[PDB]
Design a protein around this ligand. Structure first.
Ligand code: F42
Length: 141
């Protein structure tokens, strides 16, 4: 409870670790594009959970996209946000307290365009799912 428990994936855990140790100077990009670290509260364990995701930024808001590399199912961090939308978003040296809001309609469309601009592969994922990919807006706390 309130304790960070890393992803069981050694590679993900290791990427979170290097990013935090270096303010994103290490492990700060994937596919040549910037990452941020999302911290959520585990809805079952109360553990703090930390997840690298693509950076998608505008006016101090961040959108996070629950694509899980084009996996069929939602990732755990998505359920965590639905249970408690409070999160931390680390972008390099800045650590923001934010609250998540899942997007729909024209607002979603706007951030989806921003997300695909940032990481075109997201469109490939959506094309390959019949389920709408969750896009959550992280707003300043
Ligand atoms: C593997 C799983 O992680 P996850 O939360 O499902 O997240 C899956 C992935 O999205 C996560 O690995 C992302 O970091 C992958 N990922 C991206 N994932 C994305 O979805 N979008 C991205 O843009 C993205 C970019 C990215 C860039 C670099 C990189 O290295 C990884 C990237 C996990 O940690 N499972 C834990 C539990 C985690 C958890 O939060 N448990 C909750 C309960 C959750 C529940 O109720 O089911 C708790 O503790 O209470 C476990 O099995 O022990």
């Amino acid at each position: 409870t309130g304790e960070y428990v890393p992803s069981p994936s050694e590679w993900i855990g290791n990427q979170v670790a290097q990013y935090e140790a270096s303010d994103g100077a290490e492990a700060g990009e994937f596919d040549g594009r910037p990452l941020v670290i999302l911290t959520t509260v585990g809805r079952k364990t109360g553990a703090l959970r930390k997840t690298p995701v693509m950076r998608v930024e505008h006016d101090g808001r961040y959108a996070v996209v629950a694509s899980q590399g084009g996996a069929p199912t939602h990732p755990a961090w998505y359920f965590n946000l639905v249970a408690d939308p409070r999160a931390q978003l680390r972008d390099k040296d800045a650590v923001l307290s934010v609250v998540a809001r899942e997007l729909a309609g024209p607002e979603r469309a706007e951030w989806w365009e921003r997300a695909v601009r940032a990481y075109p592969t997201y469109q490939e994922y959506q094309d390959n799912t019949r389920r709408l990919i969750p896009v959550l807006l992280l707003e300043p706390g």
